[model samples]
Target: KKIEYLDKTYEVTVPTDKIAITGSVESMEDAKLLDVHPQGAISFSGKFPDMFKDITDKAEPTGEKMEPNIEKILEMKPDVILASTKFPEKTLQKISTAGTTIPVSHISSNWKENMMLLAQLTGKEKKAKKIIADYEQDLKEIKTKINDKAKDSKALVIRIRQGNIYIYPEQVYFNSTLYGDLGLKAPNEVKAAKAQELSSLEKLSEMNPDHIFVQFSDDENADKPDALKDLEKNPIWKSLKAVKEDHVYVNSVDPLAQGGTAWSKVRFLKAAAEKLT
Candidate 1:
């Protein structure tokens, strides 16, 4: 079968086995969503969700999740290699030399594409379709449940890393589940972000969203171990509408979740429904 990734096309046998994933941890997450396991995968230094432990345990590390160990992956000699688009052409070229010539497919930013690409290669298209269908069904049911209260409200997801506040575009991270799927309004700053943008408590006070979802990953905030607590004590943060109204949701989903994947979206959709109601 032929698969299209970015601007490249690669040919490989259907129902690929002995898979190797050189992308981020989330690509492995997309694999879990399809109930497929790889022979080798990138390793993460931070936490892994309970559901992902088995896959991570079984899939040998091809190196750090952020950095690929080319020799380790070459040793695995997987039938297909799932790599990230962010990798330089030189890096992909180096990996392609593995096993006579391995087919290296770049991971997509879109969740559906990610699932579909993996599913197609693994012959699990039905599972992928059902996962998406189930999400859409859930979306329909939840939209009605919270629309009245959330329709006009501004919702924002904030992350505390290294003792600083950060916000991302609506489609990035958990914002899709909040502002995109649930139809909640995004603050002007969040909507205007071209990429992840640093935010200050003063700016958050100015936005004063009706609801806030805060994610604090211990590893990401290692240097500022007390950041979340510090935010809580800050007067500017204390005065925010979300804080005053008791509408802040902290770590609503796993802190390590990649907000854009099916694994993150499905779980977050459920979390948002409960929190919003």
Candidate 2:
């Protein structure tokens, strides 16, 4: 099975051997930040450098944020172009004008939908199903193993950008994946407001969940300070119970995209289970 987008065709293969992305999808952004430029000229990277080496270069942001060079894309001529719901509309128009019709697909914020979309597109439907089944099974097993570990535990997921902290409620992609589907308890703060928007650090301190999962976006500078580095210094952060217990887990924005395949989900589950133990 294969999906043809524009003039390119992408074969659906188990464990997806290769993928090419165009536009500013979350996974693309994740890949660019990590410096794992996939086929063609795009910048993205993953935490597991060895596993996600397929991503090799960074593509310039297109449309409102940045413009895509049609000439450059023509030079690369990828097998297929992948885009998500978050992709900008202007960028899609420009790609279409280039005489190449890239197939654009939507990946919902939900994990099940995300997995199914990837599987269907890659022609690995069976593999994708098996992977999800295995994931559910493993989750059940972990639940048994750590039945008592997380009973009293509460978690909060957030991404830190430019000193501003944003907390994700159950509605967000990763928060639901980690807490809703995985059975981890979310703090009362999140429960209080069904739809919440966080724009300041002070608001974060008030919520104060038991465990914190932090992520950051950057420009791929080796000398850049990690998002969590300064966050850890805040008196407000030090005051949190999770911080005091060293239960905070910092993550990179890249893996949230490039490495977010079934394999990556498995790894994420394993790590969370360990944290519970």
Candidate 3:
């Protein structure tokens, strides 16, 4: 069978059971699709949700972004190692070149397609189809509610912590759900395009989305309390159209942390639509 990944194609021969996931999203997906915890997993960028905590609690701490010690990976001997497409190319080459052939793959964006590919690789095509169907049906019904109210509503996604703000780029997990299934329009120029780091508050007024969704830098690192205080007082933060209309929304961490899978997006969409309605 053929398995499509970002920038590369793999012919499936080996069965993926014992997996070592390097990226946050891939780890979440392996648990969801395979219905089992991977034998080894590099630590996620943030805290792991209980949804997969039972599984990843014992997994190795591989450091963030697939930068774990290569020697540790070899010792675990996972069936296949799943990495992020954003992960450095050299990391993949180094893993493959380590004197022995360890199957390593790079996961791409477009969470839905990525789920299908993982299912194919893991021989969970049936499960994948079922999950997709559930989400499709769920999103379709939700679209009715979306069109009724969300048609004119534009959505903005950004991550904030301390003073760091990263506007989410198009095609990542959060956006594919917010703009794709939810049928929300991009608020402005940054929608579904390259991400931008904002140092000034003026951009918020510039884009001025109808709805604003915020994700934190991490679970523990989130500065929502202080940020909220700052927003309440700062003229720029207060001047934001979303803040004025009370359109500012904070996302749930766990669902988004595991947002690499289709169902995870579904969970976010369903919850968001409920609030939007």
Q: What's the number of clashes in each of the models?
A: 0, 29, 0
Q: What are the models' TM-scores?
A: 0.90, 0.65, 0.78
Global lDDT of each candidate: 0.78, 0.54, 0.62
Residue 125 miss distance in model 3 (angstroms): 2.7
Error of 1 at 11 (Å): 1.8
Candidate 2 off by > 4 Å: 1-19, 24-38, 44-52, 57-67, 88-93, 97-127, 148-152, 185-201, 216-230, 252-264
Best by TM-score: 1
Model 2 has an lDDT value of 0.54
Error in Å for residue 31 of model 2: 10
Tell me the tens digit of each residue's lDDT in model 2 across 1-277.
4554334564544333244555435444344323334454333331223323445433332222134556655555554444443446676666655433343443323445545544454455676577678888997887777765574567777765555566555645465557665777766555554543554557666766677767664533245555567767878879988888888887623434422434445666777777766
Pick the winner on lDDT between candidates 1 and 3.
1
Q: What is the C-alpha RMSD of each candidate to the true structure, in Å?
A: 2.6, 6.1, 3.8
Q: Write the per-residue lDDT of candidate 1 for residues 181-204, one digit (tens) a residue.
A: 778877889889988799988888
User: Candidate 3 residues 31-90, lDDT tens each?
Assistant: 664575665665555555555676675577545654655776677776566656555667
lDDT of 2 at 203: 64
Determine which window of 10 residues in candidate 1 has minimal summed lDDT.
Answer: 99-108
TM-score computed on alpha carbons, candidate 3 = 0.78
- By lDDT, the candidates rank as 1, 3, 2
